[PDB]
Write a protein that binds this ligand. Structure first.
Ligand code: MYR
Ligand code: MYR
Ligand code: MYR
Ligand code: MYR
Ligand code: MYR
Ligand code: SAL
Length: 582
């Protein structure tokens, strides 16, 4: 081009450029004040415009990595603030850039960000919308140094639309708060997946990643040819590798190439790539990334023809094992947008074991003659779990359905921490209200994506402070066997009851003045604690104690002497409840 900055600036826009540079610097210099980044931004935008004007102006020829490294190395307190990172400045590119990557702290000290009052928030927004949004863009980016910037920028825009709209509403809090919470989760969800869709690539290798990729792509581009899906799966694997390595530029560039590629051969790949492909440079891929499944051909053959009716099956499989197996996934995946990707992998794996254990036996056609029957029970397990858990979710509500999971898992692994159980059981419940509202055709996929993060979250906590070998069994198992492993946990007969504690079961009228999502957690904490005390309690006995409590809480929060009623009836409840169990 002659000048990268000039070109990036030109096809990015001043607004987005200023935003991305800010995020970029906040991801490395996680400890410099906000006003310090604002200075650098202006400084780099000034330079950028200098190059837009004259392509041959000072340094405009330098590459973006070099320019970026110099501005980084000009920070005076670099060595005093980051120390070892300052040594990176002594080496030259590419060694210098590789050195900054290695010193990018994944999770720093930084205090938890707190949400101020809607009023001060809206007033700050109104008074000076820009430093209000940029300041927080800064707060988020320094705490999540691996979050793809363009992505973090999409969230910024959404946060903007929530303030513009709600700070102008009658009841601001009632408008903004729900939108903010919804953004937090979606944000944390997006982050978790990115960390997950790196760790996986680290542990299980390229092969397993590609497998996951073929299934996922053919499920969405069912009309594309297998050769096209292979091409995409390849480029797609290169993208994640780089993006995971942390180099933003390389990552962003590879993602752009891919998106332009898909859009040119658009006709050859999905038909639903319409709007996405006419959108600006910055959103194209993020759009392609969420595009819905194209419709499937409907004029499609049967799999058993090419994969079971032995017309030279082993002769085709030995000729190129992975390609053939890849072809299996493609065919099976695109006929089933309703299966979770892992289920597709379990089938593909099951098929693989058969071909291996069959093709080395006299007459093959009859050894693997009935594989599709091998599949049947693999497909049903997840399906039965869905509708079974979804019907329970309708009978009870999100909350009561939450208490049910609570009793179910506290019994599975009583060893686990009470606060951890409450949180995991809550997320699980949400996945229920977030997916059970879809038609059976899109439930399994939904559950899979939500369940994959909740399960990894659960697994990471257990990493730190281990508690059960069973959880560790599942957590270190194969990604394709992780959820089935958890589903296979049974009551812990071995478990020895926690000693009764008066304290843990005492309640003051303060619960009457606590928020909805606070009363619940305090009751749900008492529930876990109750089950850990009486692990042999029946669903009947437990419901009796829970009905007595539900009433007791009102009988006292609806009375004039709150805290007498809580200490008097309280002794009774505990006394009676203790006798009803044992
Ligand atoms: C990701 C870009 C954020 C840009 C600034 C928008 C304002 C964010 C809301 C401030 C509160 C954050 C904490 C929370 O929601 O719990
Ligand atoms: C001043 C240079 C900042 C460079 C890092 C930000 C990336 C700029 C290009 C944006 C391309 C995004 C491609 C995509 O996600 O589809
Ligand atoms: C609340 C913490 C529970 C920790 C251990 C149990 C994890 C079970 C979660 C995965 C649920 C899969 C669906 C099922 O119940 O079969
Ligand atoms: C996380 C709570 C989900 C609640 C709804 C029930 C879902 C049952 C599990 C289905 C698992 C699908 C993914 C897979 O094939 O392993
Ligand atoms: C050994 C006797 C312990 C007695 C204390 C009962 C514990 C109360 C937990 C029940 C929570 C029910 C939640 C609800 O109604 O929403
Ligand atoms: O990031 C992409 O370029 C992409 C392309 C096709 C399908 C899913 C994706 O994430």
């Amino acid at each position: 081009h002659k000048s990268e900055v000039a070109h990036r600036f030109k096809d990015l826009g001043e607004e987005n450029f200023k935003a991305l540079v800010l995020i970029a610097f906040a991801q490395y210099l996680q400890q410099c004040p906000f006003e310090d980044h604002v200075k650098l931004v202006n400084e780099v935008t000034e330079f950028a415009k200098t190059c837009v004007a004259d392509e041959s102006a000072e340094n405009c020829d330098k590459s973006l990595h070099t320019l970026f490294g110099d501005k980084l190395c000009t920070v005076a307190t670099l060595r005093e603030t980051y120390g070892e990172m300052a040594d990176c400045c002594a080496k030259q590119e590419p060694e210098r850039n590789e050195c900054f990557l290695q010193h990018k702290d994944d999770n720093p000290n930084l205090p938890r960000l707190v949400r101020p009052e809607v009023d001060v928030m809206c007033t700050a927004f109104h008074d000076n919308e820009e430093t209000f949004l940029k300041k927080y863009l800064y707060e988020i980016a320094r705490r999540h140094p691996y979050f793809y910037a363009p992505e973090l920028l999409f969230f910024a825009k959404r946060y903007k639309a929530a303030f513009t709209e709600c700070c102008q509403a009658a009841d601001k809090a009632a408008c903004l708060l729900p939108k903010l919470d919804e953004l937090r989760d979606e944000g944390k969800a997006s982050s978790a997946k990115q960390r997950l869709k790196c760790a996986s690539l680290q542990k299980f290798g390229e092969r397993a990643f590609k497998a996951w990729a073929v299934a996922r792509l053919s499920q969405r581009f069912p009309k594309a040819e297998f050769a096209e899906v292979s091409k995409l799966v390849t480029d797609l694997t290169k993208v994640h590798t780089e993006c995971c390595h942390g180099d933003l530029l390389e990552c962003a560039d590879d993602r752009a190439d891919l998106a332009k590629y898909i859009c040119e051969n658009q006709d050859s790949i999905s038909s639903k790539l319409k709007e996405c492909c006419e959108k600006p440079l910055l959103e194209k891929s993020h759009c392609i990334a969420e595009v819905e499944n194209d419709e499937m051909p409907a004029d499609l053959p049967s799999l058993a023809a090419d994969f079971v009716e032995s017309k030279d099956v082993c002769k085709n499989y030995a000729e190129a094992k992975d390609v053939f197996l890849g072809m299996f996934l493609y065919e099976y995946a695109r006929r089933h947008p309703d299966y979770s990707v892992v289920l597709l992998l379990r089938l593909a794996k099951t098929y693989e074991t058969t071909l291996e254990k069959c093709c080395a036996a006299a007459d093959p056609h009859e050894c693997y003659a009935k594989v599709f029957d091998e599949f049947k029970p693999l497909v049903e397990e997840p399906q039965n779990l869905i509708k079974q858990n979804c019907e329970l979710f309708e009978q009870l509500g999100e909350y009561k359905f939450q208490n049910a999971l609570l009793v179910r898992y506290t019994k599975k692994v009583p060893q686990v921490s009470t606060p951890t159980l409450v949180e995991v059981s809550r997320n699980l419940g949400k996945v229920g209200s977030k997916c059970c509202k879809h038609p059976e055709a899109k439930r399994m996929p939904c559950a899979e994506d939500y369940l994959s993060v909740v399960l990894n979250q659960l697994c990471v906590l257990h990493e730190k402070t281990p508690v059960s070998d069973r959880v560790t069994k599942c957590c270190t198992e194969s990604l394709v066997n992780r959820r089935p492993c958890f589903s296979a946990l049974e009551v812990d007969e071995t478990y020895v009851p926690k000693e009764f504690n008066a304290e843990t079961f005492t309640f003051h009228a303060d619960i009457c003045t606590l928020s909805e999502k606070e009363r619940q957690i305090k009751k749900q904490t008492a529930l876990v604690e109750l089950v850990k005390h009486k692990p042999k309690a029946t669903k009947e006995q437990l419901k009796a104690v829970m009905d007595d409590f539900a009433a007791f809480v009102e009988k006292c929060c609806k009375a004039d002497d709150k805290e007498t009623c809580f200490a008097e009836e309280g002794k009774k409840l505990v006394a009676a409840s203790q006798a009803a169990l044992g």
